[PDB]
Amino acid sequence: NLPTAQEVQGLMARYIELVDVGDIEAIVQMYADDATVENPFGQPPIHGREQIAAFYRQGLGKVRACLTGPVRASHNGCGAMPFRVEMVWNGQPCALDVIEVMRFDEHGRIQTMQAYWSEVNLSV
């Protein structure tokens, strides 16, 4: 905990900006060294900056990301947000609806991220 409810809304909106531009290195600097990511939730986790970097380089190396509603934030450093990811799959233009939950540490870095989505949230 520590970042405020207001700080958490901003940190999370910023994360979506970076994904939308595709600035891979800025994204990764947002995560704690030790951060763990579960994306999609239900999969073995990604542990550490290095492994986390790999996901973004591979997934983000023509993708667009837009928040589709307000960031919901608590007072113990956690937040949840709904967004859409636009991409192209084998020529097929797709959109994926996702909801992510994040826990920030005292330095304002992402310690934990979990993403909720599956094929049922895939759209053409």
Ligand X SMILES: C[C@]12CCc3c(ccc4cc(O)ccc34)[C@@H]1CCC2=O
Is 40 among the residues that bind a copy of itself (CB under 8 A)? Answer: yes
Token output for 77:
């450093």
Cβ atoms of 45 and 36 closer than 8 Å:
yes
Stretch that binds a copy of itself, among 12-20, 23-31, 46-54, 92-100 (CB under 8 A): 92-100
Q: In angstroms, give the least distance from the CB of 121 to a copy of itself.
A: 5
Helix ranges, the chain (H)? 5-21, 24-29, 49-60
Q: In angstroms, give the least distance from the CB of 96 to ligand X.
A: 6
Query: Is the C-alpha dihedral spanning 27, 31, 34, 35 positive or negative?
Result: negative
Number of residues that bind ligand X (CB under 6 A): 10
In the list 85, 103, 111, 112, the residue contacting ligand X (rule: CB under 6 A) is 85
In the list 58, 62, 120, 124, the residue contacting a copy of itself (rule: CB under 8 A) is 120
| Closest to 116 measured CA to CA, from 20, 39, 18, 30 | 39
